[PDB]
Design a protein around this nucleic acid. Sequence first.
DNA 1: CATTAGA
DNA 2: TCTAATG
Length: 327
Amino acid sequence: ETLNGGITDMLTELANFEKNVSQAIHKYNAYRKAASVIAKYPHKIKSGAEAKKLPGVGTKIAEKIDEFLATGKLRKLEKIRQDDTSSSINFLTRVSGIGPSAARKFVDEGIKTLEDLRKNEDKLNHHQRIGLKYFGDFEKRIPREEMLQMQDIVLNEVKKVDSEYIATVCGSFRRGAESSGDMDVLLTHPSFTSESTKQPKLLHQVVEQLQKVHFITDTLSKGETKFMGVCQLPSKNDEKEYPHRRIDIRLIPKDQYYCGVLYFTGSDIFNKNMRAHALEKGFTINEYTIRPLGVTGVAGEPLPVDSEKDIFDYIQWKYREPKDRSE
DNA sequence: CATTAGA
DNA sequence: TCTAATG
Ligand SMILES: [K+]
Ligand SMILES: [K+]
């Protein structure tokens, strides 16, 4: 957590690189397990050699460890850090809709900047054009104070369209968080569960509402169960307009709501932790259900859930307010 | 880890 | 169809 920290940081820097700038999925996967294992190790690694006794720790890596232990640096790391191409990749990647593959290609063509990207909108797809368009706004945090005004509008049209819907704004927002990155709305309907052959409209209806009123301004991607867009709080009585925000709305079989909701509410650790416990408590949890364990090794059969509580009950735990679902 | 765009 | 990008 801190005794092996530099090594873990150097290492991830190393990996992240192979992965993006190069297409070394392997080296990349290598750096990570190592970074991973060196991270658990209970003592201060004093040399490659010592490191080396580890699993995943090759001669290539141990070598890196000495140079880093020896001198507080690493050339390779220094060289990469300097590398204009590699840097360019790292950058274009911040555009929404540009992932490594497009970054490389773009650089290849000589588009290494925001401005480059502009001159060439034509070389970009709708998602990328949008991500381009709101490069700033998308990088900006979402103050809870706004999170509350957005949730508010959302639940209102939801309800307007059909009173039968149930929406929940998940994430750190739901767990308290002073600010968030984007909003995550989990949606559901009774008239939609596991079997009941969809109702694509179910999703459409609402997206259409939100738009109708200018809450939704763009569409990054609209499917029949997952809509990914951009929204904006009505810019008041002037002098202050609001930054464009990313929003994701997703349909869900009413019979799977609470688990999904449970889950997406995190935290990553609270989850993992609760989950680890359901195992002891003779269960299995995951994004959609909760199944009882059968001694033979495994088992099936989804227990029925009507609330975040059912799940709790089941593993015989203390209901934890989202607020304190931190870990 | 599953859903969407796209070519 | 595959492959990329998001979350
Ligand atoms: K080893
Ligand atoms: K990106």
